[PDB]
Design an enzyme around this catalytic site. Structure first.
Site, PDB file in Angstrom:
ATOM      1  N   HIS A  36       0.864  -1.180   0.000  1.00 33.42           N
ATOM      2  CA  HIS A  36       0.000   0.000   0.000  1.00 33.42           C
ATOM      3  C   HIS A  36       0.909   1.241   0.000  1.00 33.42           C
ATOM      4  O   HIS A  36       2.129   1.155  -0.204  1.00 33.42           O
ATOM      5  CB  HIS A  36      -0.985  -0.095   1.173  1.00 33.42           C
ATOM      6  CG  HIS A  36      -2.285   0.625   0.949  1.00 33.42           C
ATOM      7  ND1 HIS A  36      -2.374   1.995   0.852  1.00 33.42           N
ATOM      8  CD2 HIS A  36      -3.555   0.165   0.871  1.00 33.42           C
ATOM      9  CE1 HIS A  36      -3.638   2.352   0.683  1.00 33.42           C
ATOM     10  NE2 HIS A  36      -4.380   1.258   0.710  1.00 33.42           N
ATOM     11  N   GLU A 140      -1.369   5.657 -12.284  1.00 26.14           N
ATOM     12  CA  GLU A 140      -2.722   5.741 -12.837  1.00 26.14           C
ATOM     13  C   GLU A 140      -3.090   7.135 -13.300  1.00 26.14           C
ATOM     14  O   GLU A 140      -3.762   7.883 -12.578  1.00 26.14           O
ATOM     15  CB  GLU A 140      -3.782   5.233 -11.834  1.00 26.14           C
ATOM     16  CG  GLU A 140      -3.793   3.743 -11.671  1.00 26.14           C
ATOM     17  CD  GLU A 140      -4.752   3.228 -10.617  1.00 26.14           C
ATOM     18  OE1 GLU A 140      -5.479   4.061 -10.034  1.00 26.14           O
ATOM     19  OE2 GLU A 140      -4.787   2.003 -10.396  1.00 26.14           O
ATOM     20  N   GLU A 228      -0.973  -3.694 -10.925  1.00 25.01           N
ATOM     21  CA  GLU A 228      -1.853  -3.624  -9.774  1.00 25.01           C
ATOM     22  C   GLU A 228      -3.213  -4.213 -10.113  1.00 25.01           C
ATOM     23  O   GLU A 228      -3.820  -3.839 -11.112  1.00 25.01           O
ATOM     24  CB  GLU A 228      -2.057  -2.156  -9.324  1.00 25.01           C
ATOM     25  CG  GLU A 228      -2.684  -2.049  -7.953  1.00 25.01           C
ATOM     26  CD  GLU A 228      -2.963  -0.634  -7.551  1.00 25.01           C
ATOM     27  OE1 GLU A 228      -2.027   0.211  -7.545  1.00 25.01           O
ATOM     28  OE2 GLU A 228      -4.156  -0.339  -7.275  1.00 25.01           O
TER      29      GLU A 228
HETATM   30 NA    NA Z   1       1.469   2.259 -14.215  1.00 27.69          NA
END
Ligand code: NA
Ligand code: NA
Length: 303
Positions: A36, A140, A228
């Site tokens: 995390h 992201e 992920e």
């Molecule tokens: Na990435």
């Protein structure tokens, strides 16, 4: 005699014909865990927990999620020490390690691109000669940030900064819509060696339509790394959705796509692998693992 390690066995990785291969040119699949955020759950990232995951879960890659925002590196650069600790542990243990510049709420990678170039240059100068290292330059992109106008130009600035110091280790580039829109990247790829494109899925939210985008991207010859994924929904809740997660794991196996599961923490998210209070240094029995952790451990232990 000694226990063989992933790096001893596979050495320098590369991308050949759209596929991750090892130093012998043979296909290789990495399967492992992501931390995390290091600013919150960094205590779970250390040589003991990484060795435990290697020995007991069978992981061969560990991803360190160095958030930029949300109290991460931009405001608290000391988290870089935890990255260095994890990289050095991975070298000692013969494991692959993903250094993840973990943008999220800062949804455009260009926002901190100067800091990103300096960070990656430092990491590549220090560790670039080790085959263990994989760079993930923008977790992201999201919120309408586009491949052609925002992400690819960002990558075209960061890739050369890494390559000046580390000519061969893999660089993984995020894609639009929280690293879902791999088809956009496939239609306008980066023309450099040893580049992969990130795909992130959450089994409570994503299904066949996303697998279809991945198959399209692969058909254009780009390589995909699931840096992920979670067993929860996209927000971190529900389930865990183990039936849909198994379909995704079977898909990734079929396509020889490498992956890292979120997350190695006891966060109050159903994707978290550990029960509250689990030891940060490993040594977890079944009762210390969440429903998600038990399933993920079983899947990594499989062939
Ligand atoms: Na990435
Ligand atoms: Na290198």
């Amino acid at each position: 005699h000694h226990g063989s390690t992933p790096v001893e066995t596979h050495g320098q990785l590369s991308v050949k014909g759209g596929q991750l291969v090892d130093e012998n040119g043979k296909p290789v699949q990495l399967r492992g865990m992501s931390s995390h955020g290091l600013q919150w759950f960094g205590d779970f990232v250390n040589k003991d927990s990484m060795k435990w995951l290697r020995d007991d879960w069978g992981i061969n890659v560990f991803r360190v999620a160095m958030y930029t925002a949300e109290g991460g590196y931009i405001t608290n650069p000391s988290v870089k020490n935890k990255v260095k600790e994890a990289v050095e542990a991975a070298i000692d243990l013969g494991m692959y390690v993903i250094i993840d510049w973990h943008i999220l709420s800062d949804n455009d990678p260009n926002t901190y691109k100067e800091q990103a170039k300096a960070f990656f240059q430092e990491m590549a100068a220090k560790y670039g000669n080790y085959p263990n290292v994989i760079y993930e330059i923008c977790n992201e992109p999201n919120g309408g940030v586009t491949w052609s106008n925002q992400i690819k130009p960002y990558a075209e600035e960061v890739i050369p900064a890494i390559r000046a110091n580390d000519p061969d280790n893999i660089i993984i580039v995020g894609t639009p819509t929280w690293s879902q829109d791999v088809h956009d990247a496939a239609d306008n790829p980066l023309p450099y060696s040893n580049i992969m494109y990130a795909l992130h899925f959450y089994a409570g939210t994503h299904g066949q339509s996303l697998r279809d985008k991945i198959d399209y991207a692969l058909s254009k010859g780009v390589a995909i790394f699931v840096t992920e994924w979670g067993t929860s929904d996209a927000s971190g809740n529900g389930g865990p959705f183990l039936n849909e997660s198994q379909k995704w794991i079977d898909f990734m196996n079929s396509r020889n796509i490498s992956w890292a599961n979120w997350s190695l923490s006891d966060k109050s998210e159903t994707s978290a692998a550990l029960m509250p209070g689990a030891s940060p240094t490993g040594g977890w029995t079944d009762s210390n693992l969440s429903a998600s952790g038990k399933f993920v451990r079983e899947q990594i232990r499989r062939s």
